[PDB]
């Protein structure tokens, strides 16, 4: 019952029923003219001040949540790419917040990088607040995917021709490398934005995952999490499970 654990539990419980959007930021493997662009082919560290700051935040979040009782053998390249994607994902969120003139302190958000059995690396984002309404979900997904595709093409470390960069840009948009949670439906039928409950989803689902500590990553494990209150960022796996237990 450290202050950190109690603090996170209290913060989430107060936001238990806050409606938010659920996004997933991802990428897919691409071959363009014989050039392989994989999940970790985006390792340029762009020297933009805010991005640099965000990447430092991800590094230190990893460092403080590392359990050293147990050894951690995650590939350094994998760690680097996840830190970079953390900075790029948040850059996308913040760019759209700016478009809507939303004060970042009026926003609740949660970010968690995971490794799926099938899709590999992806990043869950929960985001919402007083300036958010359900009908805006599709616009948000489209805008986030514009910025995500733009930043990925800038961060790509594969030598691409201009034609190849534009092709990659359109692939990332056309194939929806940012997804939005919707209610299950038919292909023809409309899809409605499905808002989720912020505190509940974090405590009862995201904080229950197992920490990736090896390469290749455990199926369904998480790398790293963070939130708008810096509450879950530094928690070790055991502490995260304690938060779920206390939340109940
Ligand atoms: Cu996932």
Swiss-Prot record:
Motif (RCR-3): 205-209
Chain span(s) of sequence motif RCR-2: 122-124
Record PTM text: Phosphorylated.
Binding, a divalent metal cation: 114, 122, 124
Region of interest: Ori-binding: 186-190
Region of interest: DNA-binding: 1-248
UniProt-annotated location(s): Host nucleus
Domain (PV NS1-Nuc): residue spans on this chain: 16-248
Assembly and oligomerization: Homooligomer; when bound to DNA. Interacts with human SYNCRIP. Interacts with host transcription factor SP1; this interaction allows high levels of viral P38 promoter transactivation by NS1.
Function (record text): Multifunctional protein which displays endonuclease and helicase activities required for initiating and directing viral DNA replication. Also plays a role in viral packaging and transactivation of several promoters. Binds site-specifically to 2-3 approximate tandem copies of the tetranucleotide 5'TGGT3' within the origins of replication (Ori), unwinds this hairpin region and nicks one DNA strand thereby initiating the rolling circle replication (RCR). Cooperatively binds Ori with host PIF and probably other host factors, which activate the nickase function of NS1.
Protein family according to the UniProt entry: Belongs to the parvoviruses initiator protein NS1 family.
Entry remark concerning the domains of this protein: In the N-terminus, the endonuclease region is involved in binding to the origin of replication. In the middle, there are the ATPase and helicase activities. The C-terminus probably contains a transactivation domain.
Name of the protein in question: Initiator protein NS1
Organism from which the protein derives: Murine minute virus (strain MVM prototype)
Part of the whole protein covered: 6 to 253 of 672
């Amino acid at each position: 019952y450290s202050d950190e654990v109690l603090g996170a539990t209290n913060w989430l419980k107060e936001k238990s029923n806050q409606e938010v959007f659920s996004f997933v930021f991802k990428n897919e493997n691409v071959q363009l003219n014989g050039k392989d662009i994989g999940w970790n082919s985006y390792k340029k560290e762009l020297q933009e001040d805010e991005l640099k700051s965000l990447q430092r935040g991800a590094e230190t979040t990893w460092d403080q949540s590392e359990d050293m009782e147990w050894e951690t053998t995650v590939d350094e390249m994998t760690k680097k790419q996840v830190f970079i994607f953390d900075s790029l994902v948040k850059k996308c969120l913040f760019e759209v917040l700016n478009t809507k003139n939303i004060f970042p302190g009026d926003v609740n958000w949660f970010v968690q990088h995971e490794w799926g059995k099938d899709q590999g690396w992806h990043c869950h984002v929960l985001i919402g607040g007083k300036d958010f309404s359900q009908a805006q979900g599709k616009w948000w997904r489209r805008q986030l995917n514009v910025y995500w595709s733009r930043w990925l093409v800038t961060a790509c470390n594969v030598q691409l021709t201009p034609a190849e960069r534009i092709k990659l840009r359109e692939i990332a948009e056309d194939n929806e490398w940012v997804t939005l949670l919707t209610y299950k439906h038919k292909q023809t039928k409309k899809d409605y934005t499905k808002c989720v409950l912020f505190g509940n989803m974090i405590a009862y689902y995201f904080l229950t995952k197992k920490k990736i500590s090896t390469s290749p990553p455990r199926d369904g494990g998480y790398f790293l999490s963070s939130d708008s209150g810096w509450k879950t960022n530094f928690l070790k796996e055991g502490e995260r499970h304690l938060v779920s237990k206390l939340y109940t």
